[PDB]
Amino acid sequence: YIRPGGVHQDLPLGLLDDIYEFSKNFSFRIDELEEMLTNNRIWRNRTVDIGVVTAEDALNYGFSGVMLRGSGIQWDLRKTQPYDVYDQVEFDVPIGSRGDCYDRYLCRVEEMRQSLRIISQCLNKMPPGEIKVDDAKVSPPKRAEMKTSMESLIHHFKLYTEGYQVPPGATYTAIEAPKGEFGVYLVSDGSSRPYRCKIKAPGFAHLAGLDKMSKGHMLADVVAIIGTQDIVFGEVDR
Amino acid sequence: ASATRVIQLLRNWASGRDLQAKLQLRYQEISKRTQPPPKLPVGPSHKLSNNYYCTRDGRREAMPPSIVMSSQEKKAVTPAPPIKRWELSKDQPYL
Amino acid sequence: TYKFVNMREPSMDMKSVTDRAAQTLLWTELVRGLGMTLSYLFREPATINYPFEKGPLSPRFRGEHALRRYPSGEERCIACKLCEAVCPAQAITIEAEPRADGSRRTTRYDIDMTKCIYCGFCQEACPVDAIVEGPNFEFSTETHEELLYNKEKLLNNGDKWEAEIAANIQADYLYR
Amino acid sequence: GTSVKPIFSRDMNEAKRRVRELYRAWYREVPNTVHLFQLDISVKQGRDKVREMFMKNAHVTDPRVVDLLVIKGKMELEETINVWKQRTHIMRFFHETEAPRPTDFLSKFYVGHDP
Amino acid sequence: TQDTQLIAVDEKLDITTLTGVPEEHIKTRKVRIFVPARNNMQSGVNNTKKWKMEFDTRERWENPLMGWSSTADPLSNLVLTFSTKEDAVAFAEKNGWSFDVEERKVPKPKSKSYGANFSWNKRTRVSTK
Amino acid sequence: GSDRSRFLEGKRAVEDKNIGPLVKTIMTRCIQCTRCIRFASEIAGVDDLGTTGRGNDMQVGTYIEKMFMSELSGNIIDICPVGALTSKPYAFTARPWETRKTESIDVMDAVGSNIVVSTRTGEVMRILPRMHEDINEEWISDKTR
Amino acid sequence: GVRTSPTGEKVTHTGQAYDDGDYRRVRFSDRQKEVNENFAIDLIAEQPVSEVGSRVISCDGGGGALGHPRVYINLDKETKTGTCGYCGLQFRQPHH
Amino acid sequence: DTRPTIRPRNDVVHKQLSAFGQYVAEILPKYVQQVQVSCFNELEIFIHPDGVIPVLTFLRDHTNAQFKSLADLTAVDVPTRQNRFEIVYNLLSLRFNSQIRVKTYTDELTPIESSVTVYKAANWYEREIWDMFGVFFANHPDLRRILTGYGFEGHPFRKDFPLSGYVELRYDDEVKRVVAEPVELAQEFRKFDLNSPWEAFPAYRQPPE
Amino acid sequence: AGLLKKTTGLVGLAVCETPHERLKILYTKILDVLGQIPKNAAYRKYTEQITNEKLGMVKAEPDVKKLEEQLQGGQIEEVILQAENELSLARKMLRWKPWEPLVEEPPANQWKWPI
Ligand code: SF4
Ligand code: SF4
Ligand code: SF4
Ligand SMILES: [K+]
Ligand SMILES: [Zn+2]
């Protein structure tokens, strides 16, 4: 849905109201999770002071996202280098102190609630307008002008056969993906197709640090360390 | 499928909160699945005059990467001014 | 801004210490969990029984493809190869020919339902709304060959789900 | 120009040296994998396969190149003695299922248009 | 320039030992180094400014189930753009491919004059514009 | 060119004229050729193609029903910027992006014109004239096409 | 429409039909050769021709945005009814 | 801004980074060969291969740079260029919320010193680059394949490598084990010559060679 | 100074109970290791122009919190780390000899994009 130059098409009528109904209910379940585990002694011992990573080594290891915010490093791409309209949205970034497995679990759960504040603002400050860049040489024209106007059809033909030819150049854009600092390195020769696309996966740098974390911990801890790391192997294996 | 009031108290008491105010199961509050036909807006450039592409394009306005030194006193300069330490939260300080 | 998450130093007053001692000795947060699940036991299950009732969808759902045809009966596909040119999985394979009437139709329209990933680009591609995924998410087969659709199967799907595609497209033709 | 940066070896001779302890390690390595990996070939049937790669890789003369595959051979040896490979991976060296390919021109001519 | 024990190697570069190209596809295959022709039905000449190396075409048989274009030569849809010819060919010997080189066909410079369309004696007077 | 159309009127339609079983003519598409016309009157000598009228219509064609045949008649197809003069034998066999272009020499004549054999999936749909200046310029005979 | 091959197969709209030997025919046995009966070729012929009186006629194909790109068919050649290249609907002048 | 489509330009950042470009160039003139800032405010530090270790330590340790996070470590294989592979590092400076890109060139044979010491993140990125491209990295803790299958030959991301590869897999019953066979597609990859024959960007027009 | 900071926030780094003294001795070490480098080197001018000011503020400002704003480097604990890192770099930069003209020009068209 999220395409270059804007989203594919506008939301259906009544979608935002359905968002509001769910967001009302959700905070009444996030605390419900916290009731189940956050104060549970068994969950605490299985997660407190376990898989602890310090500040400098985590920073040196190429970590990002929770691995940084969990150990005390107050870094978040949504705040430091805000992309899109993330600047016009107020929110807090939970920062841990111990840096262990447990502190990240609160960091993720607190990220839940902070996201709910972002959703509340996005619904309340939705602006009118189109959903894709007006430039038809970049985003395909709507089907209405497709079937009546010469230029729209020509552009739609070439866009879906050739595609927009981007200027030559290379860039690395990273965003605060829920796992971490997901980033892509796109090198373009100038034709209608990319020349090289390196995919900075937040879990790639993380998983290299599995050995550094699990030092002296038992195997059951390694199972715990895998979970907090929040790795999905589509991103790391690319 | 509405719970009997007898167990409405049971679920409320056993969890120490009012479940019936907001439940996970959806009900008639959802938006209707059939909606009137929408009229979508037009973009800012949908003007039938003074919309020349030469003053509107974005691709043809990218210059080649500007070169500042090639291998072919001055004050020390940081890449950007150092970040300002984030202030503590106001809505919710220390948890 | 940022919010600290967990460093809350507990108080050492005798009331607080006995509270924690009672909590550790007489397991309370464990009982808090038990009371939680019991409360979450007497709720209404979120399950729905299968095919007798089915889950909810939206008119723009993407599923099994179909090749519709005009109200007259003539097929919409004029074989412009746009869908093949945009197919991310290169599942579209079509060849055209000047038909006997002189019109411009396709001899072959094999869609390999084992390659394409239901991007929906094809329904966005053809300017005559020829190819479109139907609402039928259900077409699972017992053999691999059955999934490899040709033009004939596509038209049959078009003739079967035509009532849905006309209605669904009617709803969403304004959003696009 | 002609001056290039060498990887480890400083001429052919120690480049010829490094291929030796690879063969030294590989030869010692054959009989235990045949036992550990539960292979179907004989202990004798492994040494030739270890051997035949080596003068299959014989036209190479550049010292940098020679040192480059001695690392690849060492890595392949590395990923073998920790049972990181499997029976299928090792057996892929023995081109077993693939039917023999002809060599004479006439047989090439009979099967299909290909050199 | 590096003081890193610069050995003067002289043997021509050959990395075919490492690229992993199977024995059939390294000697038998012949690559062609040429500048692509201008598509005659078009008029622009942007596609004829980069040398390209492509491999010879192999068997293309139709699949039994449904009429396909199944092939068994991996080096079929592999073209490589190159700035200049000597740089393109330097890749060929380095990868040990028996190459064939063409020459950069360029349009010869013509002389066009609108005044010629209406001459007094020369038989180049255009009959209609 | 722009990315949108400000035209708010009805487009003109032009009747098709038949000038060959080898060249298609959807004359409503082409725009004021002077390319078909010059090629017929300079490279082929056949003075049958022309323009008829003035104004927006000024129909371009042959007026009377004539049959444009010459040894080089087929070259009007690849000099047409617009898809009006199109190869009738081609007739939407395939589309440009999917086909692969290989360079060869025609053997039908003894001139040896350089041609591009556009093939896809293991079949030949089109034969295009390459450029060789002294050999064949950029033209090939209809026999070779 | 759908005819029957000498072997017994059903010719499709494209005219494809596995011939007598055609070892590929084994697949259809114990199965069926899927053929669509609503042949597009003869499903457009019976549609009548519009007798609209003008020189240039647009064809949206019905439904506006639901149809096909608006093309203008020239109804001037008084021998053959103009047809839209997108849908095949025949248009003709009302014979003056 | 009347223009609603064109991405806004940040000249202050452009001037700021360009000054830092002169900074790094002056401090290390031995390795830095070229420095440029793109139109979208990204600084590329073109260094010589032997400068991989020295230059990286400078941006990681110098007080005025403080780039203490290895974003990524990639290479773009350009068959054209004499030394085809081009190793690219991306560094993020937490203190100065800026990103830098040091790029170096390397052929198939010449090795590059492993940046594991200066950036311990590079260790796993080090293995990937060799596995996908074949750039061997000197004095590395453990250089090994990380992505390709065990015993897989060749370097896949290399341009000369075919899209489908050379080796397939299937189960063969006479051996009761997965076996490798030469690649044999049921459908060849339909390559598309989707390149416009008309120049797209007069700004980036190459000189008339 | 008040009550010493319980923690610096970041796990690892410990609160320095002798902040100013560590800054002074570290910054003096910087000016020493720099002193072993030729003056014309640009590394000397910028590092001494950076450290000597930092040494100037730490001596002048005795309050820890005002010192943090003085060098805008977060808390003191990460300041002593950076001052340590500059020490290692300066100690390692003297052997690297990064002030002579570049080792050599890169090949003709190694840069330039597109090809
Ligand atoms: S749905 Fe997408 S992937 Fe599948 S055939 Fe259509 S265009 Fe291709
Ligand atoms: S299905 Fe659509 S995109 Fe594909 S050929 Fe037909 S009209 Fe074109
Ligand atoms: S067919 Fe081509 S050359 Fe002829 S009139 Fe039309 S656009 Fe012009
Ligand atoms: K043409
Ligand atoms: Zn129509």
CSV table of C-alpha atoms in Angstrom, one decimal, chain H residues 65-160:
chain,number,residue,atom,x,y,z
H,65,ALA,CA,33.2,13.4,14.6
H,66,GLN,CA,32.1,10.7,17.2
H,67,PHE,CA,30.6,8.3,14.6
H,68,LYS,CA,30.1,5.4,17.0
H,69,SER,CA,27.6,3.2,15.1
H,70,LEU,CA,28.2,1.0,12.0
H,71,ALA,CA,25.0,1.4,10.1
H,72,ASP,CA,25.8,-1.1,7.3
H,73,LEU,CA,28.7,-2.5,5.3
H,74,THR,CA,27.9,-3.2,1.6
H,75,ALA,CA,29.6,-3.5,-1.8
H,76,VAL,CA,28.2,-2.6,-5.2
H,77,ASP,CA,29.8,-4.8,-7.8
H,78,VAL,CA,30.5,-2.7,-10.9
H,79,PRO,CA,31.8,-5.0,-13.7
H,80,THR,CA,32.9,-1.9,-15.6
H,81,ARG,CA,35.3,-0.4,-13.1
H,82,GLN,CA,38.9,-1.8,-13.1
H,83,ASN,CA,38.6,-2.9,-9.5
H,84,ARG,CA,35.0,-4.0,-9.8
H,85,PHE,CA,33.9,-4.3,-6.1
H,86,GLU,CA,33.4,-1.0,-4.2
H,87,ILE,CA,33.1,-1.5,-0.4
H,88,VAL,CA,30.8,1.0,1.2
H,89,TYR,CA,30.5,1.8,5.0
H,90,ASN,CA,27.7,3.9,6.6
H,91,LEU,CA,28.3,5.5,10.0
H,92,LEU,CA,25.9,7.3,12.3
H,93,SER,CA,27.0,9.9,14.8
H,94,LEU,CA,24.8,9.8,17.9
H,95,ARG,CA,26.2,13.0,19.3
H,96,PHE,CA,25.9,15.0,16.1
H,97,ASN,CA,22.9,13.1,14.6
H,98,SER,CA,24.6,12.9,11.2
H,99,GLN,CA,25.4,10.1,8.8
H,100,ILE,CA,28.6,9.6,6.9
H,101,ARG,CA,29.6,7.2,4.1
H,102,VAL,CA,33.2,6.1,3.5
H,103,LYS,CA,33.5,4.3,0.2
H,104,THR,CA,36.6,2.4,-1.0
H,105,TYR,CA,37.4,0.3,-4.1
H,106,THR,CA,38.8,-3.2,-4.4
H,107,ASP,CA,39.3,-5.8,-7.1
H,108,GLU,CA,38.6,-9.6,-6.8
H,109,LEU,CA,42.1,-10.4,-5.5
H,110,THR,CA,43.3,-7.6,-3.4
H,111,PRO,CA,42.2,-8.0,0.3
H,112,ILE,CA,40.8,-5.3,2.6
H,113,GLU,CA,41.7,-5.1,6.2
H,114,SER,CA,38.8,-6.2,8.4
H,115,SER,CA,37.2,-3.4,10.3
H,116,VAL,CA,36.3,-5.7,13.2
H,117,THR,CA,38.7,-3.9,15.5
H,118,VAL,CA,37.3,-0.4,14.9
H,119,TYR,CA,33.7,-1.7,14.5
H,120,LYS,CA,32.8,-5.1,16.1
H,121,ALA,CA,29.6,-4.9,14.1
H,122,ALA,CA,31.5,-5.3,10.9
H,123,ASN,CA,32.4,-8.9,11.8
H,124,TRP,CA,29.2,-10.5,10.6
H,125,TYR,CA,28.9,-7.9,7.8
H,126,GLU,CA,32.5,-8.9,6.9
H,127,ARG,CA,31.4,-12.5,6.3
H,128,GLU,CA,28.4,-11.6,4.2
H,129,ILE,CA,30.4,-9.4,1.8
H,130,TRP,CA,32.9,-12.2,1.0
H,131,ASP,CA,30.1,-14.8,0.7
H,132,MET,CA,28.0,-12.7,-1.7
H,133,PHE,CA,30.8,-11.0,-3.6
H,134,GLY,CA,34.1,-12.7,-3.0
H,135,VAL,CA,35.9,-9.7,-1.6
H,136,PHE,CA,38.3,-11.4,0.9
H,137,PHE,CA,38.9,-9.4,4.1
H,138,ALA,CA,42.3,-9.7,5.6
H,139,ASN,CA,43.1,-10.6,9.3
H,140,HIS,CA,39.4,-11.5,10.1
H,141,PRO,CA,38.5,-13.5,13.2
H,142,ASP,CA,36.5,-16.1,11.2
H,143,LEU,CA,35.7,-15.6,7.5
H,144,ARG,CA,33.0,-18.1,6.5
H,145,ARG,CA,29.8,-18.3,4.4
H,146,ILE,CA,26.8,-16.9,6.3
H,147,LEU,CA,24.0,-17.0,3.7
H,148,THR,CA,24.6,-19.5,0.9
H,149,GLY,CA,24.1,-23.2,1.4
H,150,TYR,CA,26.9,-25.3,2.7
H,151,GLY,CA,29.2,-26.2,-0.1
H,152,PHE,CA,27.6,-23.6,-2.4
H,153,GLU,CA,30.2,-22.5,-5.0
H,154,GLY,CA,30.5,-19.1,-6.6
H,155,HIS,CA,29.6,-15.6,-5.3
H,156,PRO,CA,25.9,-14.9,-6.0
H,157,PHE,CA,25.6,-11.1,-5.8
H,158,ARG,CA,28.4,-10.9,-8.4
H,159,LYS,CA,26.9,-9.5,-11.6
H,160,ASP,CA,28.3,-12.3,-13.8
